[PDB]
Design an enzyme around this catalytic site. Sequence first.
Site, PDB file in Angstrom:
ATOM      1  N   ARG A 162       0.832  -1.195   0.000  1.00 34.08           N
ATOM      2  CA  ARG A 162       0.000   0.000   0.000  1.00 34.08           C
ATOM      3  C   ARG A 162       0.871   1.252   0.000  1.00 34.08           C
ATOM      4  O   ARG A 162       1.975   1.268   0.549  1.00 34.08           O
ATOM      5  CB  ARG A 162      -0.918   0.020   1.220  1.00 34.08           C
ATOM      6  N   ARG A 217      -2.215  -2.404  -7.109  1.00 34.61           N
ATOM      7  CA  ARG A 217      -2.803  -3.616  -6.554  1.00 34.61           C
ATOM      8  C   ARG A 217      -3.734  -4.288  -7.553  1.00 34.61           C
ATOM      9  O   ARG A 217      -3.650  -5.501  -7.774  1.00 34.61           O
ATOM     10  CB  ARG A 217      -3.558  -3.311  -5.262  1.00 34.61           C
ATOM     11  N   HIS A 230      -4.227   2.594  -5.899  1.00 32.18           N
ATOM     12  CA  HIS A 230      -4.735   1.231  -6.040  1.00 32.18           C
ATOM     13  C   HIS A 230      -4.547   0.632  -7.428  1.00 32.18           C
ATOM     14  O   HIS A 230      -4.823  -0.565  -7.610  1.00 32.18           O
ATOM     15  CB  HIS A 230      -6.213   1.189  -5.662  1.00 32.18           C
ATOM     16  N   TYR A 265     -12.363  -7.328  -8.085  1.00 28.79           N
ATOM     17  CA  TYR A 265     -11.160  -7.020  -8.852  1.00 28.79           C
ATOM     18  C   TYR A 265     -10.912  -8.041  -9.950  1.00 28.79           C
ATOM     19  O   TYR A 265     -10.420  -7.684 -11.026  1.00 28.79           O
ATOM     20  CB  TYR A 265      -9.934  -6.962  -7.940  1.00 28.79           C
TER      21      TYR A 265
END
Length: 301
Positions: free
Chosen positions: A154, A264, A261, A296
């Site tokens: 992150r 990720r 993000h 996702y």
Amino acid sequence: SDEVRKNLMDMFRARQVFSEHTWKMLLSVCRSWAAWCKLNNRKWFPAEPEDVRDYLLYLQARGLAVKTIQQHLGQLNMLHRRSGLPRPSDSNAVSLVMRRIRKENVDAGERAKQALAFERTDFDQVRSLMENSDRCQDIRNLAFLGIAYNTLLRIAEIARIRVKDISRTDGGAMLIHIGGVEKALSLGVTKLVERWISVSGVADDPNNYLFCRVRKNGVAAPSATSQLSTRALEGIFEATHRLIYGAKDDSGQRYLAWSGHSARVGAARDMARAGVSIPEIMQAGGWTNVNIVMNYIRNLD
DNA sequence: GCATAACTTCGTATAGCATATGCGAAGCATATGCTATACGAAGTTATGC
């Protein structure tokens, strides 16, 4: 401000512990409640459920997403609770209107957003372009993305890592530690991080932060104590996107360009394209199982 | 002596997550509090001619 701030500081005395993100938020809710309470004069602190009903209808007429209104209601109830009064959420009418508008706006066809995916091929392209670069602040960004994709960290995790936090093996990989768990790095980007370290010279004390401010003329600066703000790290992704493509469209939509993000989601979706077993994904991300992982993965090509 | 690049501090909007309840009586779907982005803007100061 003054009156509401001094009132809230009574709760600060009574309830001194919060995240900096929470007590920022409660004040900005109270500002809007107080403003409305002035522009149609009613008693400001002790809530009346009929006034809450009026407020929720007034917000619904501005068409804010339901996730916002449910938060305004949550903060009001938190304020009553920790002050020491009955919760407005105890009202049947408040629940009834919340359920009604929730159903109405869901039937209106809203959707939760999802960020654009920083799939591997875009990394290979931007690398193929910048690999020749010598201007220092290019090197910084090329290293940063090389970690921020491969290690699945992150953004506010990677912003913290000190040179003390890093372990090295000669002729091999590099290993990183984050608060009792250790993560391992591919033999490519090791060369980029080594180039960054050796050219910038941050290594004079492991207590220095690995990432730091760089000035107009190309000279770096050390620091043991001042970290780079995450608002500039988003300014890395957005800049390289604006290098590969034209400027953002004027429609004002969100997620029109990469953000924190995007790494990720890019990694997870690419690993799904590689045919990985999903529990291996959940083990790699450490994600407690909820269908956000499926979302996702929702589609491949 | 002023203009500029690259960054820092605020503000009003949404998504993530950890925990808890029902409903039914085994397991987990849906609900609740708290924490963290995304973006536009105002403000800072060092280098330069």
